[PDB]
Amino acid sequence: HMKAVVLRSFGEAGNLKMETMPMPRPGRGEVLLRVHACGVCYHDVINRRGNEAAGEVIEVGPDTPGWKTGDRAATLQRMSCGDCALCRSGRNSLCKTDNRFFGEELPGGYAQFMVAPVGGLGRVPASLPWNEAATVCCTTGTAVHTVRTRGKVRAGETVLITGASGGVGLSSVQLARLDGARVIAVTSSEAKVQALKEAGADEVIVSRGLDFASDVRKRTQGAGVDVAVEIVGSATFDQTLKSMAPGGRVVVVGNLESGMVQLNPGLVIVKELEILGAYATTQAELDEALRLTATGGVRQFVTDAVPLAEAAKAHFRLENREVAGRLVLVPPE
Amino acid sequence: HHHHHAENLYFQGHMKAVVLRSFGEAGNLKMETMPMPRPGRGEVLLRVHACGVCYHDVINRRGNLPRTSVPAILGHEAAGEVIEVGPDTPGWKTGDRAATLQRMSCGDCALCRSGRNSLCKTDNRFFGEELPGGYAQFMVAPVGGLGRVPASLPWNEAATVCCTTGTAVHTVRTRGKVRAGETVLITGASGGVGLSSVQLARLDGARVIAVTSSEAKVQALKEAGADEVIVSRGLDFASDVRKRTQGAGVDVAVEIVGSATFDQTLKSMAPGGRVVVVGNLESGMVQLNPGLVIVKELEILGAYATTQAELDEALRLTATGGVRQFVTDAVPLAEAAKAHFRLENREVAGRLVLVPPE
Numbered sequence: 001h002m003k004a005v006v007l008r009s010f011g012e013a014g015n016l017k018m019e020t021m022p023m024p025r026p027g028r029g030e031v032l033l034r035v036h037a038c039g040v041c042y043h044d045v046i047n048r049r050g051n052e053a054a055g056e057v058i059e060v061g062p063d064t065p066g067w068k069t070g071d072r073a074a075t076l077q078r079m080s081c082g083d084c085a086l087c088r089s090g091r092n093s094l095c096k097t098d099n100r101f102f103g104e105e106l107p108g109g110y111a112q113f114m115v116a117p118v119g120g121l122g123r124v125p126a127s128l129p130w131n132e133a134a135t136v137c138c139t140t141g142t143a144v145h146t147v148r149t150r151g152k153v154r155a156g157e158t159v160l161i162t163g164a165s166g167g168v169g170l171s172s173v174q175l176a177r178l179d180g181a182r183v184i185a186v187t188s189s190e191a192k193v194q195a196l197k198e199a200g201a202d203e204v205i206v207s208r209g210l211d212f213a214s215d216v217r218k219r220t221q222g223a224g225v226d227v228a229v230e231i232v233g234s235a236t237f238d239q240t241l242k243s244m245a246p247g248g249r250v251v252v253v254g255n256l257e258s259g260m261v262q263l264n265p266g267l268v269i270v271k272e273l274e275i276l277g278a279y280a281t282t283q284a285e286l287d288e289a290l291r292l293t294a295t296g297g298v299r300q301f302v303t304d305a306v307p308l309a310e311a312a313k314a315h316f317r318l319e320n321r322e323v324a325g326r327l328v329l330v331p332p333e
Numbered sequence: 334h335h336h337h338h339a340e341n342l343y344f345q346g347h348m349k350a351v352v353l354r355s356f357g358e359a360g361n362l363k364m365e366t367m368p369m370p371r372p373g374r375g376e377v378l379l380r381v382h383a384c385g386v387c388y389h390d391v392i393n394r395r396g397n398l399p400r401t402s403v404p405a406i407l408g409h410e411a412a413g414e415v416i417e418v419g420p421d422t423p424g425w426k427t428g429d430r431a432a433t434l435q436r437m438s439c440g441d442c443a444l445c446r447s448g449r450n451s452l453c454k455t456d457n458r459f460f461g462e463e464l465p466g467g468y469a470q471f472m473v474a475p476v477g478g479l480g481r482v483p484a485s486l487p488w489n490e491a492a493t494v495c496c497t498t499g500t501a502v503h504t505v506r507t508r509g510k511v512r513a514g515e516t517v518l519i520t521g522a523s524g525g526v527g528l529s530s531v532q533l534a535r536l537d538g539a540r541v542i543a544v545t546s547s548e549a550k551v552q553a554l555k556e557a558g559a560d561e562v563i564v565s566r567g568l569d570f571a572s573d574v575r576k577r578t579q580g581a582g583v584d585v586a587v588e589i590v591g592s593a594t595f596d597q598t599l600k601s602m603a604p605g606g607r608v609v610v611v612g613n614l615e616s617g618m619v620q621l622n623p624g625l626v627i628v629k630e631l632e633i634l635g636a637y638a639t640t641q642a643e644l645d646e647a648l649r650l651t652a653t654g655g656v657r658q659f660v661t662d663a664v665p666l667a668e669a670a671k672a673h674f675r676l677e678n679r680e681v682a683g684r685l686v687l688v689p690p691e
C-alpha cells in the first residue's frame with residue numbers, strides 16, 4: 001500500500017483527495033522512487049482544471065544500468081523518447097513518440113512513492129536539500145533551456161527579463177549573469193525590487209508592462225538589449241520588442257493559459273528580431289540545473305514547506321496569489 | 334588647375350528627370366530638365382536604362398517618408414550603365430552594368446561587419462529619398478549600393494530584381510536558410526516577392542505550398558514551381574495545409590501578407606518550424622498566442638532590405654533563369670504619374686518599369 005493525493009474531478013482547490021493507493025512497481029528500464037519533496041508550480045493549478053519532485057531510488061527495475069539503490073534523482077516534467085529525428089537532433093522538447101508528462105500520464109509526485117523511466121531523471125547532488133531539489137527543474141531547469149539552449153546567451157550581451165519575479169525569472173537573472181551578461185529586470189511590484197537586485201540584476205524597472213521600453217533604452221545607452229526572456233502573463237510584449245536592439249532575440253516562455261499578446265509585425269520585420277519558443281527541460285539540462293544549484297551559481301527561494309496532506313491548502317494559497325516563491329509538499333514517512 | 338579636352342564630360346550637362354516639387358497626388362510627378370549629378374570619391378555616375386516602380390515610391394510621393402525632401406527624384410529600383418567613375422572605385426569602370434539597392438550601408442559598424450547590413454544605423458540613406466533616385470536619365474550611386482547586372486539580362490527585367498528576387502534571396506536563403514527537402518509555406522505568393530520566393534524555394538529542392546487570395550491565380554504559381562496551391566482569404570487555410578502535409582505541418586513559412594494570414598500560418602507550422610516575416614500589407618496588429626509558439630518551439634524571424642551580395646546573386650538567378658521576372662508593361666518615364674495611378678488602384682498584376690528617354 002501507499003499514501004497519495006489524488007484528483008479525480010476537476011474544479012475547486014478542495015477536490016484534491018488524500019486517497020490511500022497501491023504502491024507502483026517499476027518495469028523494464030524504470031525505477032521506484034521514495035518521494036521526499038514535490039513542488040507546486042502554477043501549471044498544476046492549470047491542471048487542476050480541464051485544459052516536479054525529487055526522491056531516493058529504493059528499487060531499481062531491469063535494464064537500468066546507471067542507477068542503484070539510494071541514488072539521488074529528480075524528475076523532469078516531460079518524458080522524452082530516446083532516438084527520434086528530433087531527439088538525436090537535440091530537439092527533445094518536441095518529440096511525439098514518447099510525450100508522457102509526469103503528473104498526467106505518469107502518476108504525479110503528490111504520492112509517497114512513484115515510478116519514473118531512466119531517461120526522465122536527473123542525478124541530484126548530495127549537497128542539495130530535498131525541498132530545494134524538487135523546485136529546480138521548473139525554475140533553473142527552465143532557465144537553462146531558455147537562457148542557454150534556445151536563447152544562446154553569450155558573454156558580453158545584455159538580457160531583458162519581463163516578469164522577473166518568479167521561479168523562472170530569478171533563476172534566469174542568476175544564470176544569465178553567471179554566463180557573463182548584463183541583466184535588466186522588469187517587475188510589477190516595488191516589493192520584488194530588492195530580491196531581483198540580490199539575484200544579480202543590473203537594472204530593475206517597476207512597470208505595469210506598457211512604459212518600460214524607453215527606460216530599457218536609456219539604461220542600454222540607446223542600444224537596446226541583445227536577448228529578451230519573455231515570461232508571458234504581464235502584458236509586456238509590445239514594450240519588449242521595442243526594447244530590442246537590431247537582430248535581438250526574444251525567447252518566449254510561460255503557460256498556455258495567458259491570453260494572446262500584442263504583436264506588431266513591423267517591429268519584427270525592420271529590426272529582424274528572432275522570437276523563439278522555449279518549452280521543456282532535457283535530462284542533460286536538469287543535470288546542469290541541479291549542479292548550478294549545488295555549485296551556488298543559481299539559488300532557490302523556497303517560501304515554505306507544506307505537509308502532503310495539505311495539498312488542497314497549497315493550491316489555494318497559490319491560486320489566490322497569496323504566496324511569493326515556490327511551495328513544496330513533503331510526504332510523511 | 335584641372336583643364337581637360339574630354340568631349341564626353343563636356344557634353345554631360347542637363348538631363349530629363351521626373352521631379353516631385355510637392356508631396357501629394359500622382360499627378361505631382363512631372364518631367365523636367367535638371368542638371369546632371371557629378372560623381373565624387375567612391376561614387377559612380379549611372380546612365381539609367383530602367384527604373385522599377387515600387388509601391389514604396391507611392392508612399393514616398395505622398396510625403397509619408399520623413400527624410401524625403403522636395404524637390405525630389407524618386408525611385409530605388411534602377412538599372413543602368415556606368416558612364417563615369419570618381420576616384421576610389423577600384424571594382425567599377427565605365428561600361429559596367431549595375432543595379433541599385435534600396436538603401437545604403439556604411440560597412441564598418443559591427444552590424445555591417447556581421448553581414449547584417451539591413452540593420453545598419455550609421456548609413457540608412459535610401460535611393461529616391463535622401464539621395465536622388467532612378468526616375469531620371471542619370472543618377473550618382475556609391476559603389477557600396479550597386480549590384481552587377483549580367484550582360485545576358487535586359488534592363489527592364491533587371492530593374493525589378495531588387496524588390497522581388499533580391500528580397501527573396503534575403504528571406505529564403507540568408508534568413509530562412511531553406512534546405513532541400515523541407516516544405517515551405519508562402520503567403521501572398523501571387524505578388525512580386527512571392528513569385529520569386531516560390532521559384533527560389535523550388536530551386537533549392539523544397540516542396541512549395543502557396544496561398545493566394547485570387548481564385549484563378551493558380552495556373553501561374555503552379556507553373557512557377559509551386560507543388561501545392563490553396564485559395565483562401567487567410568482565415569481557413571491552416572487546416573488545408575495540415576491536410577496537404579499529411580497532418581505534419583510545414584518546416585518554414587514565408588509570411589509576406591502579414592497580419593491577415595499570420596494566425597493561420599502559425600497553426601500551419603510543424604513542431605520547431607520557423608516563420609520568416611517580411612511583409613505586412615494591411616499594416617494591422619496581431620494577437621499572438623504564446624502557447625503555440627512555446628509548445629511547438631516556433632521561430633519568428635524578420636527579414637528586411639537587401640544586401641550587395643544578395644542582389645548580385647538575385648541578378649545572377651534572373652539571368653540564368655532560376656528565378657524569372659514577370660514584367661507587365663514598360664512605361665515611358667514621362668508617364669510616371671500614370672504608373673503610380675495604376676499601381677495605387679491595383680489595376681496591374683506584375684511589375685511596372687519606367688524607361689527614361691535617350
Ligand SMILES: [Zn+2]
Pocket residue numbers: 040041043052077138
Ligand atoms: Zn512544475
Ligand SMILES: [Zn+2]
Pocket residue numbers: 080081082083084085086087092095096097098
Ligand atoms: Zn523523441
Ligand SMILES: [Zn+2]
Pocket residue numbers: 438439440441442443444445446453454455456
Ligand atoms: Zn554599418
Ligand SMILES: [Zn+2]
Pocket residue numbers: 387388389409410435496
Ligand atoms: Zn522597393
